[PDB]
Design a binder for this molecule. Structure first.
Ligand code: CLR
Ligand code: CLR
Ligand code: C14
Ligand code: C14
Ligand code: C14
Ligand code: C14
Ligand code: D12
Ligand code: D12
Ligand code: D12
Ligand code: D12
Ligand code: D12
Ligand code: D12
Ligand code: D12
Ligand code: D12
Ligand code: D12
Ligand code: D12
Ligand code: D10
Ligand code: D10
Ligand code: D10
Ligand code: D10
Ligand code: D10
Ligand code: D10
Ligand code: D10
Ligand code: D10
Ligand code: D10
Ligand code: D10
Ligand code: D10
Ligand code: D10
Ligand code: D10
Ligand code: D10
Ligand code: D10
Ligand code: D10
Ligand code: D10
Ligand code: D10
Ligand code: D10
Ligand code: D10
Ligand code: OCT
Ligand code: OCT
Ligand code: OCT
Ligand code: OCT
Ligand code: OCT
Ligand code: OCT
Ligand code: OCT
Ligand code: OCT
Ligand code: OCT
Ligand code: OCT
Ligand code: OCT
Ligand code: OCT
Ligand code: OCT
Ligand code: OCT
Ligand code: OCT
Ligand code: OCT
Ligand code: OCT
Ligand code: OCT
Ligand code: OCT
Ligand code: OCT
Ligand code: OCT
Ligand code: OCT
Ligand code: HP6
Ligand code: HP6
Ligand code: HP6
Ligand code: HP6
Ligand code: CL
Ligand code: CL
Lengths: 680, 680
């Protein structure tokens, strides 16, 4: 083993700069940069095609023998849950359920082509459907007058058609906004969604989904709520109207709930003994529809059912732009939340499988899916969190599982929709609530983040609370801003350390940590692991004066107290010799006799005008009491900040900068040695 | 001159920790901390008295011979401007002007006792008066029905009294809120008001004051505006109604404006030849009142005048709490803005004279002033920015200048108010607009901050725009949040450097800077001057792979390409030996042959779970291609972050941590030397 041997002079800033000569920057012209960016080599255009059409990349590279079984199983398990989820979220959107079935088919196919993530389940989302239903009922209220040429016994088909038109218009506008954001490179903001923020946001979204499904489980009538505290208002309304519950609907829902939970526990416990998990949502749907049809619960017990499901696909229809001015604000929120849910969950799965998802391409895919689907009577889509978990955890590898689920949905649409006409809505709510269990399991992060990092636990809890009580649109931006402000908190509460020297080395460590580190007599070394910016400068100065025990104000006060008791352009030097008489020095209270204060700037990232002013004040105040202040380890960037401000207006301050702590200590000791040599 | 000599072994983390033994933390119990905090020594209670009653400190220490002349001159110059400003801002508040005169007397006296700043002019502020007038006219509209027992020719005395009652109620509530905030240590938030933010905010406030004075200068009638874009609405309304201007009012205002500007230029240019600046506002008031009375402009030309000013002070009257529920929201905003203007300007002056102001005591003083003054028919106060500049720049030393100005205001109130009854409001507006020149001079900061720091120039401009177009309440919080986010931007755009070694030393400097620094063959040293938190980790990884030119993905791709072309708990090792055949190695494109990558962590302040995951991924990916990754200069705090996360789940990673760059380089070279020794 070799050894660490260094033999060189003390490197103050002028001494080190005497060795260093400026290098010539290589020419980097912007025009040539653009010209070389517009070369258009075939590899570049192939990469562009892959970036905009990801299916052109992962589909030719499809490992059939390794992927087909997992994709098939995941697709079946995803579709059996996608059908009832589609119907339920169509009910949430104040549109007929067949439109939810449509929204479960086209967008998934288009996202298989345009999407980067290979584990998320594209489809209707409860919160997005709630926003769509809110805007649709605002524009088309229940008490609207429609001269449709019908008798007094109106079947509300015209109202449903008008609400469908409103939903398509808002979906098209949200898709256009999302596509424009994706083109404008907005997806970079996805870097601000940290893992605790994403997980708290998704858990709050799951709680929102659970709240939105309560009225259909109980069979009660409830006002639509959307906005701040919408979850609280909805829960309060449900618990208020629970006295008018439908006992038959609640019984069927709870029965499906219990069997679904039992089956899920059976699947999880016997996972190793089962070739593929049993698709339980399909069994629940079939069993609930059979019980509802056999006992005729629709009118004998007034149990709400799905209703008629027309067969066949609809031709493309141009949405009316004339409603844009009435929905644009809403179309903005749906544009954000729909992205926020999609890019969060994708990340949650991407980090689970060691790949990365392009936020810009996610925005482009979402926008194109929404805008094109609005032509096919599709309302706004997102990522279904619980269904994404089901798809990922069932062995899903690519998005071909989404295509298989869409094919099952298309089978329902084209041929077998009429079988699900008598299916109660309580069964759908029970299915959704049961499948929210995997998302509710994310509450185990609280002990985890408690043990790992309490700041990120705070981020988790703040995101959860803000996205729960406020909306997922205002709550998300609140959480993002607070998570960013956690960095400000970190800089505002740094580790102020007083350093001591490990003997016979150049290693300087916190004096109160190891106890072989010994403080150098007459020298104080103070270290902050933070920048010295404006929100930090005063705290840094106070901590420097407190921890080191060298307060210039206290020193001046003691000198004046002894003065009271004993009685019975061309610049001046920075450090003023203490002209205190020895007879009056007999009145000094005993002290550490510190002649130099070393400020460790190795971990100081930057310093602004306020920090520079504080530093200059510190230097001047310590020089007024005859104490030298040295800066050790100032980076070239921090030196540039000190130079851009007028810190080095006096060139003498240049000799206060040293390369390292050991350089500063040696320079101070040499300064003292020369001073005592010249003294006598 | 001595030399830097170091001779020691290579300090990897285990090697250095073998020398270091844990120290015993001194016992610091919270109960004993509270017990020693409740000692109540006479010095402690004296300090408490000084902190809560600052006049008990600076008044006994009043240097009479050095301060009296400056205080007298500053007080006279402050009062001559305080009178018309008080009348004008009373007009802004929809209250009779005598109430502005009252608001110019009691709060200044109380702030002389309770205030920490010794240069700001306490009094009515245009924006606070605008908020008070807005709430007063909202609660008491111009078309209100008052059964006051009067004829059809109502003189609007009852409406004025009701508006005064509303103003007192909102003032009392705002004062209570401010006092409660000051007690609760809210003033700490004053640390978040950096100098560019403060100066931009104050310049925007000056523009607000200029906008609010236009209608009285032109003599036009304008709707009251308060809220977002209130300045734009007010300016648009004034320029719309300017066709109905009062030519006499505009002429008198512009004449006073021109003489005031000429006199101010005369005072500034001949400052050295004048013992004291001429008080020009008093001359303007006297001259305008004399012209208005002599030519009888009140009804001959329908020129708006100040109106009657009753003489004598009013007895204390209890404000009606019954209006609190109607004004509380407004009382919150006035509580914030009034503090925000006061603590900003104070800081602006404090930094100018080398002292500090306690934000908590500023809040307490403002709250007590407002709450007690509301008993004396005083509406909410703040710091007058232009008058504060006048007081500071005229030689003001203590707050006794404020007391002299208050004594002049009291002289006007008690005996000579009736002389100012015929004074036109155009003269008051002209005086205010002329005196806003010193505040408008702050626009010179734009070239200054352009040269010093463009980030803080951005802070200046953002604060100005936000506080201008939005209110001073929403604009201020917007500016504070954006100024805080500038730190996030700084961390998100750090200096990614590739380091090279200065020969015969241990100094490692950016390779592209000095050109005597030479890169060590086979070793890459990468440095970031930022933390590696979540919003930074992916950028840091990309920059590491790009700047160093060592991309593990590209290396694996090239190895597989050569494979194609040539054909025609117990853990595994971190770094996998590259089992590439020499015959296939003949297919390697030439490369740098880098065996070790050194990551400089000296300037990395902290690392969270996301950063730790990125770092572990970097280590694993580089070890998969047979490249070692070393961490150099990891602080004890960063080591604690890596340990709290499961980074050191494999103990072998402990040997990847070195004390410094030179230690890591020597360790890598020794590792290679031992490898070649054992090879053959
Ligand atoms: C200061 C940092 C730490 C947090 C900032 C949070 C901000 C962005 C949050 C806090 C609460 C939020 C408000 C809560 C409610 C509403 C009402 C709604 O109809 C429009 C949005 C609006 C007005 C929100 C705007 C954004 C908001 C002001
Ligand atoms: C960089 C940005 C995101 C930092 C945070 C700025 C936040 C705190 C600002 C920016 C825009 C602001 C909003 C702008 C306008 C209004 C309408 C007004 O009637 C109530 C306040 C409210 C709702 C503001 C609340 C605060 C607000 C949301
Ligand atoms: C043990 C001292 C640190 C404790 C940190 C706990 C963080 C809790 C954050 C709660 C945030 C709630 C937002 C409404
Ligand atoms: C080990 C973590 C020590 C700190 C625990 C408490 C963290 C509190 C973070 C508060 C951040 C507030 C940002 C607005
Ligand atoms: C020369 C490249 C840096 C230029 C920085 C200029 C900053 C201007 C900020 C403007 C903010 C306006 C907010 C509406
Ligand atoms: C010399 C300064 C280099 C950077 C100039 C441009 C600074 C732009 C700051 C933008 C901050 C945005 C925070 C929301
Ligand atoms: C950047 C998001 C908005 C893109 C512009 C959309 C404008 C709507 C299209 C015109 C409708 C009349
Ligand atoms: C509203 C549009 C915002 C666009 C923001 C683009 C930011 C791109 C930064 C790229 C950094 C690598
Ligand atoms: C990806 C396929 C897009 C096809 C869009 C066709 C739109 C036709 C609209 C006809 C309106 C009458
Ligand atoms: C987010 C940018 C605005 C989104 C597009 C709004 C289009 C409004 C059209 C209004 C027509 C009167
Ligand atoms: C992002 C491109 C979306 C294209 C979908 C159709 C846009 C136009 C709608 C019909 C206008 C008449
Ligand atoms: C913290 C600021 C609010 C302090 C509480 C004020 C409550 C008003 C007093 C009671 C009025 C009826
Ligand atoms: C609304 C009340 C907020 C109180 C915040 C007090 C913060 C004090 C921090 C003290 C750090 C030295
Ligand atoms: C600092 C002096 C405060 C005096 C407050 C007296 C309040 C008297 C109110 C009488 C109401 C009738
Ligand atoms: C900032 C905390 C609230 C300020 C005090 C509000 C008092 C409201 C009283 C309402 C009475 C009905
Ligand atoms: C902060 C203390 C202010 C005291 C001023 C009077 C508060 C009570 C107002 C009258 C209530 C009847
Ligand atoms: C309106 C903003 C359009 C996009 C500006 C450039 C963003 C960064 C591109 C790399
Ligand atoms: C705690 C939920 C809100 C109140 C629900 C009960 C209201 C009365 C129901 C009879
Ligand atoms: C007698 C039971 C009739 C059930 C008809 C609907 C069956 C649903 C299968 C999906
Ligand atoms: C993605 C394939 C879309 C096919 C739409 C067919 C519509 C037929 C309407 C009669
Ligand atoms: C995999 C099944 C795809 C859907 C088939 C639908 C048949 C419709 C027959 C009318
Ligand atoms: C609302 C239901 C919350 C249930 C939390 C379950 C956490 C289990 C961690 C193992
Ligand atoms: C709001 C309910 C929170 C429940 C947290 C339970 C965490 C259990 C982790 C094992
Ligand atoms: C070890 C237990 C940690 C518990 C942290 C979660 C606290 C939840 C408070 C709402
Ligand atoms: C991650 C960016 C989140 C932006 C939220 C914006 C909310 C707008 C609500 C209308
Ligand atoms: C709005 C109140 C913000 C308080 C921040 C406290 C930070 C303390 C750091 C020492
Ligand atoms: C409501 C907050 C009351 C004050 C909490 C303690 C603030 C820090 C005191 C030093
Ligand atoms: C640009 C200011 C707003 C328009 C002012 C002029 C309106 C017409 C005045 C006759
Ligand atoms: C003839 C002029 C009368 C002027 C009376 C008011 C004088 C104002 C002096 C402050
Ligand atoms: C600060 C001194 C306050 C004196 C108030 C006197 C009021 C008298 C009313 C008749
Ligand atoms: C310095 C002048 C103080 C105010 C004197 C007021 C005299 C009033 C006489 C009735
Ligand atoms: C609105 C008037 C702005 C005038 C700016 C003057 C700046 C002078 C710098 C010397
Ligand atoms: C909005 C007007 C801005 C004027 C800036 C002028 C700066 C001059 C500095 C010498
Ligand atoms: C040297 C000139 C610097 C000018 C910076 C101010 C720009 C103002 C843009 C609104
Ligand atoms: C420096 C703290 C500024 C806080 C602004 C709050 C605005 C509230 C408006 C009602
Ligand atoms: C709301 C858009 C925020 C964009 C921030 C851009 C920061 C760029 C740092 C590289
Ligand atoms: C190179 C083929 C890319 C995928 C085309 C679409 C296949 C369904
Ligand atoms: C290399 C295979 C290209 C075609 C993929 C399958 C298209 C349906
Ligand atoms: C190598 C190409 C495999 C394609 C598999 C397609 C499965 C539908
Ligand atoms: C490795 C894939 C083999 C099967 C190719 C697809 C056959 C249908
Ligand atoms: C989710 C698709 C199920 C289709 C079942 C059709 C036969 C009942
Ligand atoms: C790097 C591409 C930027 C594109 C900006 C938006 C172009 C319309
Ligand atoms: C209220 C219904 C009782 C019978 C069904 C019970 C299912 C748990
Ligand atoms: C082992 C799971 C039993 C499920 C019983 C019903 C749950 C609601
Ligand atoms: C799921 C089968 C239910 C059968 C009910 C039959 C009632 C006539
Ligand atoms: C009104 C409740 C909002 C909750 C936000 C929590 C942020 C700490
Ligand atoms: C942790 C720092 C938060 C500061 C927010 C701004 C308060 C005015
Ligand atoms: C020790 C005296 C403090 C000031 C008392 C008030 C003087 C007007
Ligand atoms: C030391 C002087 C105390 C009194 C100051 C003046 C009080 C009016
Ligand atoms: C040393 C005490 C001086 C007091 C001066 C008071 C001026 C009014
Ligand atoms: C140094 C102050 C001398 C004057 C004291 C006050 C005399 C009125
Ligand atoms: C600002 C106070 C002036 C008082 C003047 C009284 C004589 C005109
Ligand atoms: C350090 C004092 C804190 C006071 C908190 C508020 C007490 C009511
Ligand atoms: C129209 C004659 C004006 C006389 C007074 C002068 C004020 C400018
Ligand atoms: C030297 C200042 C002359 C002032 C003329 C009038 C300014 C509006
Ligand atoms: C400022 C003196 C004005 C005098 C005007 C006299 C008109 C009768
Ligand atoms: C609507 C104008 C707001 C201006 C805010 C500026 C912040 C960069
Ligand atoms: C979603 C954007 C949050 C603000 C980030 C600003 C960083 C400079
Ligand atoms: C019963 C009260 C509900 C509050 C919101 C819970 C999500
Ligand atoms: C739980 C459903 C069973 C149907 C018969 C209920 C009486
Ligand atoms: C004439 C338009 C005025 C816009 C606001 C200026 C302050
Ligand atoms: C000439 C403008 C001032 C009006 C004075 C009228 C006597
Ligand atoms: Cl969902
Ligand atoms: Cl002002």
């Amino acid at each position: 083993t070799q050894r660490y041997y260094v033999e060189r002079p003390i490197f103050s800033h002028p001494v080190l700069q005497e060795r260093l000569h400026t290098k010539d920057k290589v020419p980097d012209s912007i025009a040539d940069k653009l010209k070389q960016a517009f070369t258009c080599t075939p590899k570049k255009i192939r990469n562009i095609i892959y970036m905009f059409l990801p299916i052109t990349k992962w589909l030719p590279a499809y490992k059939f023998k390794e992927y087909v079984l997992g994709d098939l199983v995941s697709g079946i398990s995803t579709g059996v849950l996608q059908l009832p989820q589609g119907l339920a979220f169509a009910m949430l959107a104040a549109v007929p359920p067949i439109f939810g079935l449509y929204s479960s088919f086209y967008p998934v196919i288009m996202y298989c082509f345009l999407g980067t993530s290979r584990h998320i389940s594209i489809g209707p989302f409860a919160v997005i459907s709630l926003m769509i239903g809110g805007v649709a009922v605002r524009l088309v209220p229940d008490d609207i007058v429609i001269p449709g040429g019908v008798n007094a016994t109106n079947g509300t088909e015209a109202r449903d058609a008008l609400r469908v038109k409103v939903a398509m218009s808002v979906t098209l506008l949200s898709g256009i906004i999302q596509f424009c954001l994706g083109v404008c490179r907005f997806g970079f903001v996805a870097i601000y969604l940290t893992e605790p923020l994403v997980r708290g946001f998704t858990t709050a979204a799951a709680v929102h989904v659970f709240t939105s499904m309560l009225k259909y489980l109980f069979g009660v009538k409830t006002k639509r709520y959307s906005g701040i505290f919408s979850v609280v208002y909805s829960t309060v309304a449900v618990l208020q109207n629970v006295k008018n519950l439908n006992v038959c609907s609640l019984g069927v829902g709870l029965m499906v709930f219990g069997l679904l939970l039992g089956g899920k526990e059976f699947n999880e416990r016997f996972k190793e003994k089962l070739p593929a998990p049993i698709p339980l949502e399909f069994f629940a749907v079939v069993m609930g529809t059979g019980i509802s049809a056999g006992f005729n619960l629709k009118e004998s017990y007034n149990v709400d059912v799905v209703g008629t499901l027309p067969l066949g696909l609809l031709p493309p229809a141009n949405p009316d732009t004339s409603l844009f001015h009435l929905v644009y604000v809403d179309a903005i929120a749906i544009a954000i939340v729909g992205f926020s849910v999609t890019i969060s969950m994708a990340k949650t799965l991407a980090n689970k499988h060691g790949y990365q998802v392009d936020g810009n391409q996610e925005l482009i895919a979402l926008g194109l899916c929404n805008s094109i689907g609005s032509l096919f009577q599709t309302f706004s889509i997102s990522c279904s969190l619980s269904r994404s978990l089901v798809q990922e955890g069932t062995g899903g590898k690519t998005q071909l599982a989404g295509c298989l689920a869409s094919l099952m949905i298309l089978l329902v649409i084209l041929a077998t929709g009429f079988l699900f006409e008598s299916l109660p809505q309580a069964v759908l709510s029970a299915i959704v609530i049961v499948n929210l269990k995997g998302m509710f399991m994310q509450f185990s992060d609280l002990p985890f983040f408690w043990r790992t990092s309490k700041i990120e636990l705070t981020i988790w809890l703040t995101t959860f609370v803000s996205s729960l009580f406020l909306g997922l649109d205002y709550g998300l931006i609140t959480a993002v801003i607070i998570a960013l402000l956690t960095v400000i908190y970190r800089t505002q509460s740094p580790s102020y350390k007083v350093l001591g020297k490990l003997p016979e080395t150049d290693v300087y460590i916190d004096i109160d940590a190891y106890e072989e580190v010994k403080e150098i007599p007459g020298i104080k070394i103070f270290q902050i692991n933070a920048p010295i910016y404006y929100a930090n400068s005063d705290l840094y100065s106070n901590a420097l004066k407190r921890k080191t025990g060298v307060n210039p104000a206290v020193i001046m006060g003691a000198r004046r107290k002894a003065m009271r008791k004993y009685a019975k352009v061309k610049y001046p030097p920075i450090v003023i010799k203490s002209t205190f008489p020895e007879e009056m020095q007999r009145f000094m209270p005993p002290g550490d006799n510190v002649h130099t204060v070393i400020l460790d700037f190795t971990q100081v990232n930057f310093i602004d005008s306020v920090g520079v002013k504080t530093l200059a004040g510190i230097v001047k105040e310590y020089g007024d009491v005859g104490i030298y202040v040295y800066l050790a380890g100032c980076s070239a960037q921090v030196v540039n900040d000190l130079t851009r401000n007028r810190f080095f207006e006096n060139p003498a301050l240049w000799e206060l900068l040293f390369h390292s702590i050991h350089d500063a200590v040696l320079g101070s000791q040499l300064r003292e040695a020369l001073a005592e040599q010249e003294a006598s």
